[PDB]
From a paper:
Our 3D classifications revealed a class corresponding to a pentameric structure of ChlI, which we attribute to an intermediate state of ChlI complex formation. The map reached an overall resolution of 4.9 Å and differs significantly from the hexamer maps. The ChlI pentamer shows a spring-washer-like helical organization with an opening of approximately 45 Å between the first and last monomers in the complex, which would be sufficient to accommodate an additional monomer of ChlI. The resolution obtained for this structure allowed for the fitting of α-helices and β-strands of ChlI monomers but restricted the accurate determination of bound nucleotide molecules. However, the cryo-EM density obtained contains areas that are not occupied by the polypeptide chain of the ChlI protein and are close to the nucleotide binding pocket (insets 1–4). Therefore, we suggest that the ChlI pentamer carries at least four nucleotide molecules that we, however, could not unambiguously assign to ATP or ADP. The three central monomers of the pentamer contain partially folded insertions and generally show higher local resolution. In contrast, the two peripheral monomers are less resolved, possibly due to the increased flexibility of the ChlI pentamer at its ends. Of note, our pentameric structure of ChlI also contains nucleotide molecules bound between adjacent monomers, supporting the model that ChlI requires ATP for oligomerization. The oligomers then grow and form helical spring-washer-like pentameric structures, potentially representing a resting state of the enzyme, similar to the Lon protease’s open helical state or the AAA+ protein RavA, which creates a mix of open spiral and closed planar ring state populations.
Author numbering:
A (entry chain C): 14 to 93, 102 to 124, 137 to 332, 338 to 353
B (entry chain B): 14 to 93, 98 to 124, 137 to 331, 339 to 353
C (entry chain A): 14 to 76, 99 to 113, 116 to 124, 137 to 176, 184 to 331, 339 to 353
D (entry chain E): 20 to 46, 49 to 65, 142 to 153, 159 to 174, 186 to 194, 204 to 214, 217 to 219, 221 to 330, ...
E (entry chain D): 14 to 65, 109 to 111, 141 to 175, 189 to 285, 290 to 309, 313 to 330, 349 to 353
Amino acid sequence: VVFPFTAIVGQEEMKLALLLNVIDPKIGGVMIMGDRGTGKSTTIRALADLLPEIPVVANDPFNSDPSDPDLMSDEVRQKSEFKKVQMVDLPLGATEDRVCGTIFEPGLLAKANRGILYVDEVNLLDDHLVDVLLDSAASGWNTVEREGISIRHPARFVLVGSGNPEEGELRPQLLDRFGMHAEIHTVKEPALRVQIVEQRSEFDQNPPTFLEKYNPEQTALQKKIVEAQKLLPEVKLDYDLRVKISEVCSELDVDGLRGDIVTNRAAKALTAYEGRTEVTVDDIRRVITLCLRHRLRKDDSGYKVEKVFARIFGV
Amino acid sequence: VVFPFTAIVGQEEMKLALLLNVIDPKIGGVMIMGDRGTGKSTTIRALADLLPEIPVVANDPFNSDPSDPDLMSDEVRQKSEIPIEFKKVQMVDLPLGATEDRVCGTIFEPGLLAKANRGILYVDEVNLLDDHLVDVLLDSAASGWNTVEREGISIRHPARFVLVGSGNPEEGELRPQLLDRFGMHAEIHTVKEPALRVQIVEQRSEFDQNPPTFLEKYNPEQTALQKKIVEAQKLLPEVKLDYDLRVKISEVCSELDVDGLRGDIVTNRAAKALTAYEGRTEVTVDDIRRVITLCLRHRLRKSGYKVEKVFARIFGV
Amino acid sequence: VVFPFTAIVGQEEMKLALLLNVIDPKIGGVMIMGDRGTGKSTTIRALADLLPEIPVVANDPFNIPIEFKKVQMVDLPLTEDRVCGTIFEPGLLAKANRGILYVDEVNLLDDHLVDVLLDSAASGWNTIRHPARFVLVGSGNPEEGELRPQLLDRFGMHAEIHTVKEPALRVQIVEQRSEFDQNPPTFLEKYNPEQTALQKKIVEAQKLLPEVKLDYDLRVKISEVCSELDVDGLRGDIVTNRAAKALTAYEGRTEVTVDDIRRVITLCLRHRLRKSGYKVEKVFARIFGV
Amino acid sequence: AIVGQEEMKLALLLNVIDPKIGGVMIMRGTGKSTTIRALADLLPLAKANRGILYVDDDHLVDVLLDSAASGWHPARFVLVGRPQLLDRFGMHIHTKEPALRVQIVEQRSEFDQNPPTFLEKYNPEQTALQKKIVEAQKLLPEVKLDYDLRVKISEVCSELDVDGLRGDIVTNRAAKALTAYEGRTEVTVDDIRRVITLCLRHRLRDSGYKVEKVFARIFG
Amino acid sequence: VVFPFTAIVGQEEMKLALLLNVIDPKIGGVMIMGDRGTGKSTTIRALADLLPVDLLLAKANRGILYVDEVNLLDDHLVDVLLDSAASGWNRFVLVGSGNPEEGELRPQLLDRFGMHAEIHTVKEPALRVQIVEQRSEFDQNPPTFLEKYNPEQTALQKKIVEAQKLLPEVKLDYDLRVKISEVCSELLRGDIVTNRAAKALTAYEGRTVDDIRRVITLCLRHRLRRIFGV
């Protein structure tokens, strides 16, 4: 009851950005920054059936797999269904109590453990969850401050928001502390856009029929991700190239130590869709722009990074 | 009894705009700007008294569509018979500064979002209105089903109703983020000939004269519109659009700076209603371009002559 | 009993306007301002007596043999369910039927609560369908604020009391009031003959009202005059037409002449006048050429 | 129970025989209930069909205020106690010489220690006061006010800026009501000057001095 | 739920400065500059730095507090905590934390910053990259990762634990105090703590004027806004 897998073709790099956040949860997140809404909610919801039916336990508000004492918060840890993903968005008008529950009264974040908490126009929210939500992912749990009550039930999510350049982006406080940064371009190919309208008509002609048109293609895309689960083991680079990765920043590593460490793990994922068991050279260059471009403070951006990348690796 | 559906005597363009939206349920957003809310209320009554009968089944509060679609998974699906029923149109307009809980409901108590299965929803002086529940209502246009989850609830009232917008310009434009989802938005301008309005004023007195002879005054004229609209309803699927002409449509909006082709997408579908009204099956390039330009004026962020000048040499001039 | 209608001295403009609304329900409505009414209730109690008895409230608790009820009317309240009704329990909006109520303390009132009054003209029923055809008299308060960009624009005969000194007149009024309050006995007879003639004239005018005559072609001048001003929601022509009809069925002249404009320009235009009287009169004279 | 103290008692006595006049709006007061009890001494809801009530707006009080003129279920009650609520009033003390305090202290000792057998101290005046009230009652609906004098009275409103003028009508009737205990055939400044600012301080828009200065200009 | 304090490296003097006021009850908040992804990590590391809040009064007696550049924080406490600093009673031992780009606090607060600390940036992350790998090693089974460094961490509880019960064995030299007047008094109230600082500084290890000379410029900038013959 949604758009197809490769729907709204064009955000191929964006599809890759979404894939980058997938599989590996240590990336941190993403910040959608484009011209307008453009119906990006479908692109946000494009990973609806993409998530497998992760195993379920009982029917608690928090989405929890069975067993896993590390994932058992209060009752399952002392007590002794393969539910679909439930990624949700964040209402504009909201309060801190709305993101919690006065116990045991739960909260929206707690009920959405291990999910893609969608968000858009984050520039509107001032301070309520600017650092509270950013730091929540690192903790991995939802602590309570209700006097004696202090339940710290585990909290897991994806934490990838969105916003519009018109209302600004942020006073830089946790933007470096946030995940990778990316944006969107302007579609100038009317013929390509014409097929999108045809694709919309294809989506409108018969949702189920259209689905049967590319149903086998949908299965193939999910196949690489499932096998990529085992790809996390090994892939141990000699770190000899990673030695120069820090030296690559140099003038561009003025501040944000934390950021440099994180980009290193990206290469393993970068050399994971390609299937290479060893470290693939030039993949850092393919991810250098998507690494700390927004985090790189300034007054040629990518072009300047590319010019700097010439001395960093040698080309 | 209400004033005649042919008592508009003006705003032909606004009248034409409202009729096309009636024909295609997925047309989009409809709104009218101006300084005469009473005029919008007048059109509201005229629009309400501008449709054939619709069937219900027995008693369903939200909607009792007699087994037309499979969207009866609620109680009717269990019951899938007291179904020999067919009601008429019914408008709906929420009071200003209403209650969100009343707008939503609880559990199951039905909220204010339980009006006609389609259309009916209308909003006068929506320029002020409120920020909360407005985007949800804008999103409710494509919702197709309610979202009830209070205290762990789970219910989805399958309703899909069009909306009509009205608000005085003195209150200012809405938020640009919320300003989107505007399929059609225009304004109505008066004339400096009270003499001409005096006829309608005299007609208003004739309208206020007696309900007798009021229906017989234009019943044959009124019957023509019902037959023409119903005729296009059956032939609506037979729509022919030229891809080469369709290619020009995006090329037409090449210098539009739409900041998102969402508006241009449904803009192509706009000419379908004009073709259905015309009766011609093949797309007429000129008519299509004109309709698209007229509809895109509201979404054109930054007059229509410049767009018309832009339309010149784009569609071919 | 209360003070007689003719016993009231002053506010002749208000008296002329108030009678028009009762004369024809078509009348849009009057609105009145002016702090320190000092008898505002009596100023409206006059219309209560001036009404022929009609068969009303016939064994129906909504207002077999039919009793020719003389008259009935309330003024105003000090809950919304109490204002309308309950579910079938009728509320305060269940007695104004075939009557009229004042708008006392509407300067404060309550937004989104006093709106059913505007949404009450030509109701014909309720929504439980209780017919409603009540009249309304606006009672505003000066210096108490006027937040009605177009909310009170619905007002038709907008006027207010503007007495200044009237020293000898005030003394005479006070003396007459004291005399009337001392003993209504024979105070009724002091002016009894006058009320009957007025009641008969009003009844005759109401009876002959349907045979009114006018001329839209002649009213083209009024249309042009309205065009000279600025309007947004119209209804000005309707107000002018109703005022002209009342003026025709106010002196008995079964025709149309250019005097209703001079009689009711202030009463009609000022209600929706742009945000004065002298300028409106000058414009009307220039348009008419007089 | 207190000798003298006619600064505020005189208004109460004048209003005692003025059922048409109404509106007690006070804003000393240590006696409070005791002062009310002192008022009940100089006197013989449902049972209040013919009586007086004391006040210790909204819904009940606002309805109670209009129930004065709408004293019919007959009420006929005498009330004791924003600009809109100010209209329901026609009449609106002082707690410093130690000599007054010494007399009060001695009276307080006389009252508290000698609650009994102390009636004869004020009984001769209080008992005779009933005849004075009775004498004023019989001739109450007999006196009249001069229209030529009323012109001077009406002239007071010219400089006055308080709207409504209902109290002014009452004030014109107030002077005629007064002087009944006095027994004089007509009413001189005695009734004019004293009762001028008596009700004027309540519905006022130098609180009294300016009014008195205008009154002095208005009066001869 | 703990991290090895000694695992982090760089600006090790700050940890000693943190260790200087770790068991000091008459010290109070100490200024510490250097705000970045690092500062947050170090603060969390400070919490997990030794066993036996930050930026509620009953559960606050005798507790440290990590500031967050209070210049940008609420002024209600700023107008109060500044005077509440060294108030005497209702206790707590906060720690001034922030950055020049993150604010400069208040001038009275600037006039009394206690000990002054800062954190700089160093290139050639030879050890930092290994620390990043150690953090990755810390990421890989943190319950087991801490166990690898646990024996070293285990041999740290009694490093200075018994060095504070009988720490005030001696007192600052009177002649040394007069020598402070040449620079410290010539260029106050903060000097009184610096005067007894050497007793606190040279106590944890096994109980010297070299530490005092080193600590001479440790908090000079906090009061500035050779004396010991150096």
